[PDB]
Amino acid sequence: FFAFAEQMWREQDPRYACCENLVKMAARRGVYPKPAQFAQGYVRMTGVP
């Protein structure tokens, strides 16, 4: 019972919670993980009009 009470407290703290639970808490304060990015740039194309 002591372990259960402590464990279910640890799962509610940012520096000890599980990965899945961590994101759920973060979403409640406007913080989200950064998704992957795609490269970008400009290209010059020449041809007969």
Binding site: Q7, E11, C18, E20, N21
Partner: protein, 48 residues
């Protein structure tokens, strides 16, 4: 990693096995005996 609230049946059996092995020396739990009421009361306290 994650540990969550156990289900009823999976929880009652855990108590019965633990109670039987550490007290009655592996003896089976005969229904309607005094140990039967002790085991179920123990489970009730666990779930509440």
């Amino acid at each position: 990693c994650t540990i969550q609230r156990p289900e009823p049946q999976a929880l009652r059996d855990k108590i019965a096995t633990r109670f039987s092995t550490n007290v009655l020396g592996g003896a089976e739990i005969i229904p309607e005996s005094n140990e039967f009421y002790v085991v179920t009361l123990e489970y009730a306290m666990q779930e509440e």
